[PDB]
Amino acid sequence: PEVIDDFLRNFFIKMGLSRTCECFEAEWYELKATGRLDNSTTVPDVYLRNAELEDDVAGLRRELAEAKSIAGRASATWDKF
Amino acid sequence: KPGQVVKKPEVIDDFLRNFFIKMGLSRTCECFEAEWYELKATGRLDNSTTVPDVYLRNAELEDDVAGLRRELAEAKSIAGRASATWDKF
């Protein structure tokens, strides 16, 4: 795999800036139709690991930040009880 | 490698910047820079370190995984303890 287009799109999704990066999604398409580069510069494996760890740390941080929040809600519950 | 200029894999941000410059996608470069600065300002994803080393970024992500995960699973255990306490109350 390691298609630079897919890598860029996934990184934009992770960063949440894909909405403005849709401008890139259009520019890339137009210049690909013009055929500036018929191939894709392969992404380095280390940058691939960067993206993977980015989404993984995102997973942890959000998936248990919510745990901190539910712990606070439980704290309120046992305070009332 | 006699007298060769050192080239190292830079940070992901600078790598994407250089890729945009190389392909000439100037509009995309402008949009990415502007929105990246806005993202840093909003602080939704603020990377404190700015050392342009990809291996160092991997190290930062891994130590984040470890140090954060321990406390966060600790918070899940604390939520379980709070469940038990409110059952008792």
Side-chain angles (χ1 to χ4, degrees):
Chain A
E2 323 175 358
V3 166
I4 199 167
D5 181 49
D6 305 358
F7 174 90
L8 275 160
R9 210 142 301 165
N10 293 346
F11 179 71
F12 298 155
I13 297 173
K14 296 186 202 68
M15 295 298 102
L17 308 184
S18 49
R19 298 285 75 78
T20 59
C21 288
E22 278 171 2
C23 307
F24 154 82
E25 303 174 6
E27 298 285 334
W28 194 81
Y29 167 84
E30 192 162 9
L31 293 188
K32 186 72 172 181
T34 67
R36 291 180 66 91
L37 194 64
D38 296 353
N39 301 335
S40 294
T41 298
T42 59
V43 177
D45 291 331
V46 189
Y47 290 83
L48 294 174
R49 186 49 189 167
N50 272 23
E52 291 146 15
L53 271 171
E54 279 165 5
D55 63 70
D56 291 337
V57 181
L60 277 159
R61 72 181 73 187
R62 308 159 187 177
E63 188 55 45
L64 298 179
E66 304 157 7
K68 280 179 160 56
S69 72
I70 196 68
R73 303 158 202 174
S75 83
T77 58
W78 62 270
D79 277 312
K80 305 157 195 172
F81 295 141
Chain B
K1 285 183 166 182
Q4 182 171 354
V5 182
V6 294
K7 292 179 179 178
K8 298 298 159 297
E10 57 190 359
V11 74
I12 180 167
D13 184 86
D14 295 353
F15 159 68
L16 295 191
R17 202 166 306 179
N18 293 17
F19 177 71
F20 288 148
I21 292 171
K22 285 176 184 58
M23 321 325 278
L25 303 154
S26 64
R27 216 150 178 177
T28 79
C29 187
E30 300 145 8
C31 295
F32 161 74
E33 291 158 341
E35 211 54 43
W36 187 257
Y37 187 76
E38 173 181 349
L39 182 145
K40 289 289 161 293
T42 60
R44 64 181 293 166
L45 296 173
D46 188 16
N47 297 330
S48 56
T49 60
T50 56
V51 179
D53 288 331
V54 62
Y55 315 99
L56 277 182
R57 184 48 189 170
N58 290 318
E60 296 164 356
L61 291 163
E62 288 139 0
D63 62 52
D64 280 351
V65 166
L68 286 157
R69 176 184 290 169
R70 66 177 196 80
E71 173 52 51
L72 286 175
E74 271 171 350
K76 181 177 74 174
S77 62
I78 284 171
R81 299 168 213 173
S83 67
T85 58
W86 78 251
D87 296 350
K88 174 252 196 181
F89 303 138

Coordinates of all heavy atoms in Angstrom, one line a residue, chain B:
Chain B
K1 N 31.0 7.0 2.5 CA 30.3 8.3 2.3 C 31.2 9.5 2.7 O 31.1 10.0 3.8 CB 29.0 8.4 3.2 CG 27.9 7.6 2.6 CD 26.6 7.7 3.5 CE 25.4 7.2 2.8 NZ 24.1 7.4 3.6
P2 N 32.1 9.8 1.8 CA 33.1 10.9 2.1 C 32.5 12.3 1.8 O 32.2 12.6 0.7 CB 34.3 10.6 1.3 CG 33.7 9.8 0.1 CD 32.3 9.3 0.4
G3 N 32.5 13.2 2.8 CA 32.1 14.5 2.6 C 30.7 14.7 2.1 O 30.4 15.5 1.2
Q4 N 29.7 13.9 2.6 CA 28.3 13.9 2.1 C 27.5 14.8 3.1 O 27.7 14.6 4.3 CB 27.8 12.5 2.0 CG 26.3 12.5 1.5 CD 25.8 11.1 1.2 OE1 26.6 10.2 1.2 NE2 24.6 11.0 0.8
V5 N 26.6 15.6 2.5 CA 25.7 16.4 3.4 C 24.7 15.5 4.0 O 24.1 14.7 3.3 CB 25.1 17.5 2.5 CG1 24.2 18.3 3.4 CG2 26.1 18.4 1.9
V6 N 24.5 15.6 5.3 CA 23.6 14.7 6.0 C 22.2 15.0 5.7 O 21.8 16.2 5.7 CB 23.9 14.7 7.5 CG1 25.3 14.2 7.9 CG2 23.8 16.2 8.1
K7 N 21.4 14.0 5.4 CA 20.0 14.1 5.2 C 19.3 13.2 6.1 O 19.5 12.0 6.0 CB 19.6 13.9 3.7 CG 20.1 15.0 2.8 CD 19.7 14.6 1.3 CE 20.2 15.7 0.4 NZ 19.9 15.4 -1.0
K8 N 18.4 13.7 6.9 CA 17.6 12.8 7.8 C 16.1 13.0 7.6 O 15.7 14.0 7.2 CB 17.9 13.2 9.3 CG 19.4 13.0 9.7 CD 19.8 11.6 9.5 CE 21.3 11.4 9.4 NZ 21.8 12.1 8.2
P9 N 15.4 11.9 7.9 CA 13.9 12.0 7.8 C 13.4 13.0 8.7 O 13.5 12.9 10.0 CB 13.4 10.6 8.1 CG 14.6 9.7 7.8 CD 15.8 10.5 8.1
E10 N 12.8 14.1 8.2 CA 12.3 15.2 9.1 C 11.0 14.9 9.7 O 10.4 13.8 9.6 CB 12.2 16.5 8.2 CG 11.3 16.4 7.0 CD 11.5 17.6 6.1 OE1 12.2 18.5 6.4 OE2 10.8 17.6 5.0
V11 N 10.4 15.9 10.4 CA 9.1 15.7 11.0 C 8.0 15.5 9.9 O 8.2 15.9 8.8 CB 8.7 16.8 12.0 CG1 8.4 18.1 11.2 CG2 7.6 16.4 13.0
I12 N 6.9 14.9 10.3 CA 5.8 14.7 9.3 C 5.3 16.0 8.8 O 5.0 16.2 7.6 CB 4.7 13.9 10.0 CG1 3.5 13.7 9.0 CG2 4.1 14.6 11.2 CD1 2.5 12.7 9.4
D13 N 5.2 17.1 9.6 CA 4.8 18.4 9.1 C 5.7 18.9 8.0 O 5.2 19.3 7.0 CB 4.7 19.4 10.3 CG 4.2 20.7 9.9 OD1 2.9 20.9 9.9 OD2 5.0 21.6 9.6
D14 N 7.0 19.0 8.3 CA 8.0 19.5 7.3 C 8.0 18.6 6.1 O 8.2 19.0 5.0 CB 9.3 19.6 7.9 CG 9.4 20.7 9.0 OD1 8.4 21.4 9.2 OD2 10.4 20.8 9.7
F15 N 7.8 17.2 6.3 CA 7.8 16.4 5.1 C 6.6 16.7 4.2 O 6.8 16.7 3.0 CB 7.8 14.9 5.6 CG 7.2 13.9 4.6 CD1 8.0 13.7 3.4 CD2 6.0 13.3 4.7 CE1 7.5 12.8 2.5 CE2 5.6 12.4 3.8 CZ 6.3 12.2 2.6
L16 N 5.5 16.9 4.8 CA 4.3 17.3 4.0 C 4.5 18.6 3.3 O 4.1 18.8 2.2 CB 3.0 17.2 4.8 CG 2.6 15.9 5.4 CD1 1.2 15.9 6.0 CD2 2.7 14.8 4.3
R17 N 5.1 19.6 4.0 CA 5.4 20.9 3.5 C 6.3 20.7 2.2 O 6.1 21.3 1.2 CB 6.0 21.8 4.5 CG 5.9 23.3 4.2 CD 6.3 24.1 5.4 NE 5.5 23.7 6.6 CZ 5.6 24.3 7.8 NH1 6.5 25.2 8.0 NH2 4.8 23.8 8.8
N18 N 7.4 19.9 2.4 CA 8.3 19.8 1.3 C 7.7 19.0 0.1 O 7.9 19.3 -1.0 CB 9.6 19.0 1.8 CG 10.4 19.8 2.8 OD1 9.9 20.8 3.3 ND2 11.6 19.4 3.0
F19 N 6.8 18.0 0.4 CA 6.1 17.3 -0.6 C 5.2 18.3 -1.4 O 5.1 18.3 -2.7 CB 5.3 16.2 -0.1 CG 4.5 15.4 -1.1 CD1 5.1 14.6 -2.1 CD2 3.1 15.5 -1.1 CE1 4.4 14.0 -3.0 CE2 2.4 14.9 -2.1 CZ 3.0 14.1 -3.0
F20 N 4.5 19.1 -0.7 CA 3.6 20.1 -1.4 C 4.4 21.1 -2.2 O 4.1 21.3 -3.4 CB 2.8 20.9 -0.4 CG 1.7 20.1 0.3 CD1 1.3 20.4 1.6 CD2 1.0 19.1 -0.4 CE1 0.3 19.6 2.2 CE2 0.0 18.4 0.2 CZ -0.4 18.6 1.5
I21 N 5.6 21.5 -1.7 CA 6.4 22.4 -2.5 C 6.9 21.7 -3.7 O 7.0 22.3 -4.8 CB 7.6 22.9 -1.6 CG1 7.0 23.9 -0.5 CG2 8.6 23.7 -2.5 CD1 8.1 24.3 0.5
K22 N 7.3 20.4 -3.6 CA 7.9 19.7 -4.7 C 6.9 19.5 -5.8 O 7.1 19.7 -7.0 CB 8.5 18.4 -4.3 CG 9.8 18.5 -3.5 CD 10.3 17.1 -3.0 CE 11.6 17.3 -2.2 NZ 11.4 18.2 -1.1
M23 N 5.7 19.0 -5.4 CA 4.6 18.9 -6.4 C 4.0 20.2 -6.9 O 3.3 20.2 -7.9 CB 3.5 18.0 -5.9 CG 4.0 16.8 -5.1 SD 5.6 16.2 -5.7 CE 5.0 15.2 -7.1
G24 N 4.4 21.3 -6.3 CA 3.9 22.6 -6.7 C 2.5 22.9 -6.4 O 1.9 23.9 -6.9
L25 N 1.9 22.1 -5.5 CA 0.5 22.3 -5.1 C 0.4 23.5 -4.2 O 0.2 23.3 -3.0 CB -0.1 21.1 -4.5 CG -0.1 19.7 -5.2 CD1 -0.1 18.6 -4.2 CD2 -1.3 19.7 -6.1
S26 N 0.7 24.7 -4.7 CA 0.8 25.9 -3.9 C -0.4 26.2 -3.1 O -0.4 26.6 -1.9 CB 1.2 27.1 -4.7 OG 0.2 27.4 -5.7
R27 N -1.6 26.1 -3.8 CA -2.9 26.3 -3.1 C -3.0 25.4 -1.9 O -3.4 25.8 -0.8 CB -4.0 26.1 -4.0 CG -5.2 27.1 -3.8 CD -5.9 27.4 -5.0 NE -7.1 28.3 -4.8 CZ -7.9 28.8 -5.7 NH1 -7.7 28.5 -7.0 NH2 -8.9 29.6 -5.4
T28 N -2.7 24.1 -2.0 CA -2.7 23.1 -1.0 C -1.8 23.5 0.1 O -2.1 23.4 1.3 CB -2.4 21.7 -1.5 OG1 -1.0 21.6 -1.6 CG2 -3.1 21.5 -2.8
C29 N -0.6 24.0 -0.2 CA 0.4 24.4 0.8 C -0.1 25.5 1.6 O 0.0 25.5 2.8 CB 1.7 24.7 0.1 SG 3.1 25.1 1.2
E30 N -0.7 26.5 0.9 CA -1.2 27.7 1.7 C -2.3 27.2 2.6 O -2.4 27.6 3.8 CB -1.8 28.7 0.7 CG -0.7 29.3 -0.2 CD -1.3 29.6 -1.6 OE1 -2.5 29.5 -1.8 OE2 -0.5 29.9 -2.5
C31 N -3.3 26.4 2.1 CA -4.4 25.9 2.9 C -3.9 25.1 4.1 O -4.3 25.3 5.3 CB -5.3 25.1 2.1 SG -6.2 26.0 0.8
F32 N -2.9 24.2 3.9 CA -2.4 23.4 5.0 C -1.7 24.2 6.0 O -1.9 24.0 7.2 CB -1.4 22.3 4.4 CG -0.5 21.8 5.4 CD1 -1.0 20.8 6.4 CD2 0.8 22.1 5.5 CE1 -0.1 20.3 7.3 CE2 1.7 21.6 6.4 CZ 1.2 20.7 7.3
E33 N -0.8 25.2 5.6 CA -0.1 26.0 6.6 C -1.1 26.8 7.4 O -1.0 26.9 8.6 CB 0.9 26.9 5.8 CG 2.0 26.2 5.2 CD 2.7 27.0 4.1 OE1 2.1 27.9 3.6 OE2 3.9 26.7 3.8
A34 N -2.1 27.5 6.7 CA -3.0 28.3 7.5 C -3.8 27.5 8.5 O -3.9 27.8 9.6 CB -4.0 29.0 6.5
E35 N -4.4 26.3 8.0 CA -5.2 25.5 8.9 C -4.4 24.9 10.0 O -4.9 24.6 11.1 CB -6.0 24.5 8.1 CG -7.3 24.1 8.6 CD -8.2 25.3 8.9 OE1 -8.2 26.2 8.0 OE2 -8.8 25.4 9.9
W36 N -3.1 24.5 9.7 CA -2.2 24.0 10.7 C -2.0 25.0 11.8 O -2.0 24.7 13.0 CB -0.9 23.5 10.1 CG 0.0 22.8 11.0 CD1 1.1 23.3 11.6 CD2 -0.2 21.4 11.4 NE1 1.7 22.3 12.4 CE2 0.9 21.2 12.3 CE3 -1.1 20.4 11.1 CZ2 1.1 19.9 12.9 CZ3 -0.9 19.2 11.7 CH2 0.2 18.9 12.6
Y37 N -1.7 26.2 11.4 CA -1.5 27.3 12.4 C -2.7 27.5 13.2 O -2.7 27.7 14.5 CB -1.0 28.6 11.8 CG -0.6 29.7 12.7 CD1 0.6 29.6 13.4 CD2 -1.5 30.7 13.0 CE1 1.0 30.6 14.3 CE2 -1.1 31.7 13.8 CZ 0.1 31.7 14.5 OH 0.5 32.7 15.4
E38 N -3.9 27.5 12.6 CA -5.2 27.6 13.3 C -5.4 26.4 14.2 O -5.9 26.6 15.3 CB -6.3 27.8 12.3 CG -7.7 27.7 12.9 CD -8.8 27.8 11.9 OE1 -8.5 28.1 10.7 OE2 -10.0 27.6 12.2
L39 N -5.0 25.2 13.8 CA -5.2 24.1 14.7 C -4.3 24.2 15.9 O -4.7 23.9 17.1 CB -4.9 22.8 13.9 CG -5.0 21.5 14.7 CD1 -5.5 20.4 13.7 CD2 -3.7 21.0 15.3
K40 N -3.0 24.6 15.7 CA -2.2 24.8 16.9 C -2.7 25.9 17.8 O -2.7 25.8 19.0 CB -0.8 25.2 16.4 CG 0.0 24.1 15.8 CD 0.5 23.1 16.8 CE 0.9 21.8 16.2 NZ -0.3 21.1 15.5
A41 N -3.3 27.0 17.2 CA -3.9 28.0 18.0 C -5.1 27.5 18.8 O -5.2 27.8 20.1 CB -4.3 29.2 17.2
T42 N -6.0 26.8 18.2 CA -7.1 26.3 18.9 C -6.7 25.2 19.9 O -7.5 25.0 20.9 CB -8.1 25.6 17.9 OG1 -7.4 24.6 17.2 CG2 -8.6 26.7 16.9
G43 N -5.5 24.6 19.8 CA -5.1 23.7 20.8 C -5.8 22.4 20.8 O -5.8 21.7 21.9
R44 N -6.6 22.1 19.8 CA -7.2 20.7 19.7 C -6.1 19.7 19.7 O -6.2 18.6 20.3 CB -8.1 20.6 18.5 CG -7.4 20.7 17.2 CD -8.4 20.6 16.0 NE -9.0 19.3 15.9 CZ -10.0 19.0 15.1 NH1 -10.7 19.9 14.4 NH2 -10.5 17.7 15.1
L45 N -5.0 19.9 19.0 CA -3.8 19.0 19.0 C -2.6 19.9 19.0 O -2.1 20.4 18.0 CB -3.9 18.1 17.7 CG -5.0 17.1 17.6 CD1 -4.9 16.5 16.2 CD2 -4.9 16.1 18.7
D46 N -2.1 20.1 20.2 CA -0.9 21.0 20.5 C 0.3 20.1 20.8 O 0.3 19.5 21.9 CB -1.1 22.0 21.6 CG 0.0 23.0 21.7 OD1 0.8 23.1 20.7 OD2 0.1 23.7 22.7
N47 N 1.2 20.0 19.9 CA 2.5 19.2 20.1 C 3.5 20.2 20.7 O 4.0 21.1 20.1 CB 3.0 18.6 18.8 CG 2.0 17.6 18.2 OD1 1.3 17.0 18.9 ND2 2.0 17.5 16.9
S48 N 3.8 19.9 22.0 CA 4.8 20.8 22.7 C 6.1 20.8 22.1 O 6.7 21.8 21.8 CB 4.8 20.4 24.2 OG 5.2 19.0 24.3
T49 N 6.7 19.6 21.9 CA 8.0 19.4 21.2 C 7.9 19.8 19.8 O 6.9 19.6 19.1 CB 8.5 18.0 21.4 OG1 7.6 17.1 20.8 CG2 8.6 17.6 22.9
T50 N 9.0 20.4 19.3 CA 9.1 20.8 17.9 C 10.5 20.3 17.3 O 10.9 20.8 16.2 CB 9.0 22.3 17.7 OG1 10.0 23.0 18.5 CG2 7.6 22.7 18.1
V51 N 11.1 19.3 17.9 CA 12.4 18.8 17.3 C 12.0 18.0 16.1 O 11.2 17.1 16.1 CB 13.1 17.9 18.4 CG1 14.4 17.4 17.8 CG2 13.4 18.7 19.6
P52 N 12.6 18.4 14.9 CA 12.3 17.8 13.7 C 12.9 16.4 13.4 O 13.7 16.2 12.5 CB 12.7 18.8 12.6 CG 13.9 19.5 13.3 CD 13.7 19.4 14.8
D53 N 12.6 15.5 14.3 CA 13.1 14.1 14.2 C 12.0 13.1 14.2 O 11.2 13.1 15.2 CB 14.1 13.8 15.4 CG 15.4 14.5 15.2 OD1 15.8 14.8 14.0 OD2 16.1 14.8 16.2
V54 N 11.9 12.3 13.2 CA 10.7 11.4 13.1 C 10.9 10.3 14.1 O 9.9 9.8 14.7 CB 10.6 10.9 11.6 CG1 11.9 10.1 11.3 CG2 9.4 10.0 11.4
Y55 N 12.1 9.8 14.3 CA 12.3 8.8 15.4 C 11.9 9.4 16.8 O 11.4 8.7 17.6 CB 13.7 8.3 15.3 CG 14.2 8.0 14.0 CD1 15.0 8.9 13.3 CD2 13.9 6.8 13.3 CE1 15.5 8.6 12.0 CE2 14.3 6.5 12.1 CZ 15.1 7.4 11.4 OH 15.6 7.1 10.1
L56 N 12.3 10.6 17.0 CA 11.9 11.3 18.2 C 10.4 11.4 18.4 O 9.9 11.3 19.5 CB 12.6 12.6 18.4 CG 14.0 12.6 18.9 CD1 14.6 14.0 19.0 CD2 14.1 11.9 20.2
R57 N 9.7 11.7 17.2 CA 8.3 11.8 17.3 C 7.7 10.4 17.7 O 6.7 10.3 18.4 CB 7.7 12.2 15.9 CG 6.2 12.4 15.9 CD 5.8 13.2 17.1 NE 4.3 13.2 17.3 CZ 3.7 13.7 18.3 NH1 4.3 14.2 19.4 NH2 2.4 13.6 18.4
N58 N 8.3 9.3 17.1 CA 7.9 8.0 17.5 C 8.1 7.7 19.0 O 7.2 7.2 19.7 CB 8.6 6.9 16.7 CG 8.2 6.9 15.2 OD1 7.0 7.0 14.9 ND2 9.1 6.8 14.3
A59 N 9.2 8.2 19.5 CA 9.5 8.0 20.9 C 8.5 8.8 21.8 O 8.0 8.3 22.8 CB 10.9 8.5 21.2
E60 N 8.2 10.0 21.3 CA 7.2 10.8 22.0 C 5.8 10.1 22.0 O 5.1 10.1 23.1 CB 7.1 12.2 21.4 CG 8.3 13.0 21.5 CD 8.3 14.2 20.6 OE1 7.4 14.4 19.8 OE2 9.3 15.0 20.6
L61 N 5.4 9.6 20.9 CA 4.1 8.9 20.8 C 4.1 7.7 21.7 O 3.1 7.4 22.4 CB 3.8 8.5 19.4 CG 3.5 9.8 18.5 CD1 3.7 9.4 17.0 CD2 2.1 10.3 18.8
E62 N 5.2 6.9 21.7 CA 5.3 5.7 22.6 C 5.3 6.0 24.0 O 4.6 5.4 24.8 CB 6.5 4.9 22.2 CG 6.4 4.2 20.8 CD 7.7 4.3 20.1 OE1 8.7 4.8 20.6 OE2 7.7 3.7 18.9
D63 N 6.0 7.0 24.5 CA 6.0 7.4 25.9 C 4.7 8.0 26.3 O 4.2 7.8 27.4 CB 7.2 8.3 26.2 CG 7.1 9.7 25.5 OD1 6.1 10.3 25.5 OD2 8.1 10.0 24.9
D64 N 4.0 8.7 25.4 CA 2.6 9.1 25.6 C 1.8 7.9 25.8 O 1.0 7.9 26.8 CB 2.1 10.0 24.4 CG 2.6 11.4 24.5 OD1 3.2 11.8 25.5 OD2 2.4 12.1 23.5
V65 N 1.9 6.9 24.9 CA 1.1 5.7 25.1 C 1.3 5.1 26.5 O 0.3 4.9 27.2 CB 1.5 4.7 24.0 CG1 0.9 3.3 24.4 CG2 0.9 5.1 22.7
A66 N 2.5 5.0 26.9 CA 2.8 4.3 28.2 C 2.3 5.1 29.4 O 1.4 4.7 30.2 CB 4.3 4.0 28.3
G67 N 2.8 6.4 29.5 CA 2.5 7.2 30.7 C 1.0 7.6 30.7 O 0.5 7.6 31.8
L68 N 0.4 7.8 29.6 CA -1.0 8.1 29.6 C -1.9 6.9 29.8 O -2.8 7.0 30.6 CB -1.4 8.8 28.3 CG -0.9 10.2 28.1 CD1 -0.8 10.6 26.6 CD2 -1.8 11.2 28.8
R69 N -1.5 5.8 29.2 CA -2.3 4.6 29.3 C -2.4 4.1 30.8 O -3.5 3.7 31.2 CB -1.8 3.5 28.4 CG -2.5 2.2 28.6 CD -1.9 1.0 27.8 NE -2.0 1.2 26.3 CZ -1.4 0.5 25.4 NH1 -0.5 -0.4 25.7 NH2 -1.6 0.8 24.1
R70 N -1.3 4.2 31.5 CA -1.3 3.7 32.8 C -2.3 4.5 33.7 O -3.2 3.9 34.3 CB 0.1 3.7 33.5 CG 0.7 5.1 33.7 CD 2.0 5.1 34.3 NE 2.3 6.4 34.8 CZ 1.8 6.9 36.0 NH1 1.0 6.2 36.7 NH2 2.2 8.1 36.4
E71 N -2.3 5.8 33.6 CA -3.2 6.6 34.4 C -4.6 6.5 33.9 O -5.5 6.5 34.7 CB -2.7 8.1 34.3 CG -3.7 9.1 34.9 CD -4.0 8.7 36.4 OE1 -3.1 8.5 37.2 OE2 -5.2 8.6 36.7
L72 N -4.8 6.3 32.6 CA -6.2 6.3 32.1 C -6.8 4.9 32.4 O -8.0 4.9 32.8 CB -6.1 6.5 30.6 CG -5.8 7.9 30.0 CD1 -5.7 7.9 28.5 CD2 -6.9 8.8 30.5
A73 N -6.1 3.8 32.3 CA -6.6 2.6 32.9 C -6.8 2.7 34.4 O -7.7 2.1 34.9 CB -5.7 1.4 32.5
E74 N -5.9 3.5 35.0 CA -6.1 3.7 36.4 C -7.4 4.5 36.7 O -8.1 4.2 37.7 CB -5.0 4.5 37.0 CG -3.8 3.6 37.5 CD -2.6 4.4 37.8 OE1 -2.5 5.6 37.5 OE2 -1.7 3.9 38.4
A75 N -7.8 5.4 35.8 CA -9.0 6.1 35.9 C -10.2 5.2 35.7 O -11.3 5.3 36.3 CB -9.1 7.3 34.9
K76 N -10.1 4.2 34.8 CA -11.2 3.2 34.6 C -11.3 2.4 35.9 O -12.5 2.1 36.3 CB -10.8 2.3 33.4 CG -11.9 1.2 33.2 CD -11.6 0.4 31.9 CE -10.4 -0.6 32.2 NZ -10.2 -1.5 31.0
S77 N -10.2 2.0 36.5 CA -10.3 1.3 37.8 C -10.9 2.1 38.9 O -11.7 1.6 39.7 CB -8.9 0.8 38.2 OG -8.0 1.9 38.4
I78 N -10.6 3.4 38.8 CA -11.2 4.3 39.8 C -12.7 4.5 39.6 O -13.5 4.6 40.5 CB -10.5 5.7 39.7 CG1 -9.1 5.6 40.4 CG2 -11.3 6.8 40.3 CD1 -8.3 6.9 40.2
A79 N -13.1 4.4 38.3 CA -14.6 4.4 38.0 C -15.2 3.2 38.6 O -16.3 3.2 39.1 CB -14.8 4.6 36.5
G80 N -14.6 2.0 38.4 CA -15.1 0.8 39.1 C -15.2 0.9 40.6 O -16.2 0.5 41.2
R81 N -14.1 1.5 41.2 CA -14.2 1.7 42.6 C -15.3 2.6 43.0 O -16.0 2.4 44.0 CB -12.8 2.3 43.1 CG -11.6 1.4 42.8 CD -10.3 2.2 43.1 NE -9.3 1.7 42.2 CZ -8.1 2.3 42.1 NH1 -7.8 3.4 42.8 NH2 -7.2 1.8 41.2
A82 N -15.6 3.7 42.3 CA -16.7 4.6 42.5 C -18.0 3.9 42.4 O -18.9 4.2 43.1 CB -16.6 5.8 41.6
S83 N -18.1 3.0 41.4 CA -19.3 2.2 41.3 C -19.6 1.4 42.5 O -20.7 1.4 43.1 CB -19.2 1.2 40.1 OG -18.2 0.3 40.3
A84 N -18.5 0.7 43.0 CA -18.7 -0.1 44.3 C -19.0 0.8 45.4 O -19.9 0.5 46.2 CB -17.4 -0.8 44.6
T85 N -18.4 2.0 45.5 CA -18.7 2.9 46.7 C -20.1 3.4 46.6 O -20.8 3.4 47.7 CB -17.7 4.1 46.7 OG1 -17.8 4.8 45.4 CG2 -16.3 3.6 46.9
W86 N -20.7 3.7 45.4 CA -22.0 4.2 45.4 C -23.0 3.1 45.6 O -24.1 3.3 46.2 CB -22.3 5.0 44.1 CG -22.6 4.2 42.9 CD1 -21.8 4.1 41.8 CD2 -23.8 3.5 42.5 NE1 -22.4 3.4 40.8 CE2 -23.6 3.0 41.2 CE3 -25.0 3.3 43.2 CZ2 -24.6 2.2 40.6 CZ3 -26.0 2.5 42.5 CH2 -25.7 2.0 41.3
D87 N -22.7 1.9 45.2 CA -23.5 0.7 45.6 C -23.6 0.6 47.1 O -24.6 0.4 47.7 CB -22.9 -0.6 45.0 CG -23.0 -0.5 43.5 OD1 -23.7 0.4 42.9 OD2 -22.4 -1.5 42.9
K88 N -22.4 0.7 47.8 CA -22.4 0.7 49.2 C -23.2 1.8 49.9 O -24.0 1.5 50.8 CB -20.9 0.7 49.7 CG -20.7 0.8 51.2 CD -20.2 2.2 51.6 CE -19.6 2.2 53.0 NZ -19.2 3.6 53.4
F89 N -23.1 3.0 49.4 CA -23.8 4.1 50.0 C -25.3 3.9 49.8 O -26.1 4.2 50.7 CB -23.4 5.4 49.3 CG -21.9 5.7 49.5 CD1 -21.2 6.2 48.4 CD2 -21.3 5.5 50.7 CE1 -19.8 6.5 48.6 CE2 -19.9 5.8 50.8 CZ -19.2 6.3 49.8

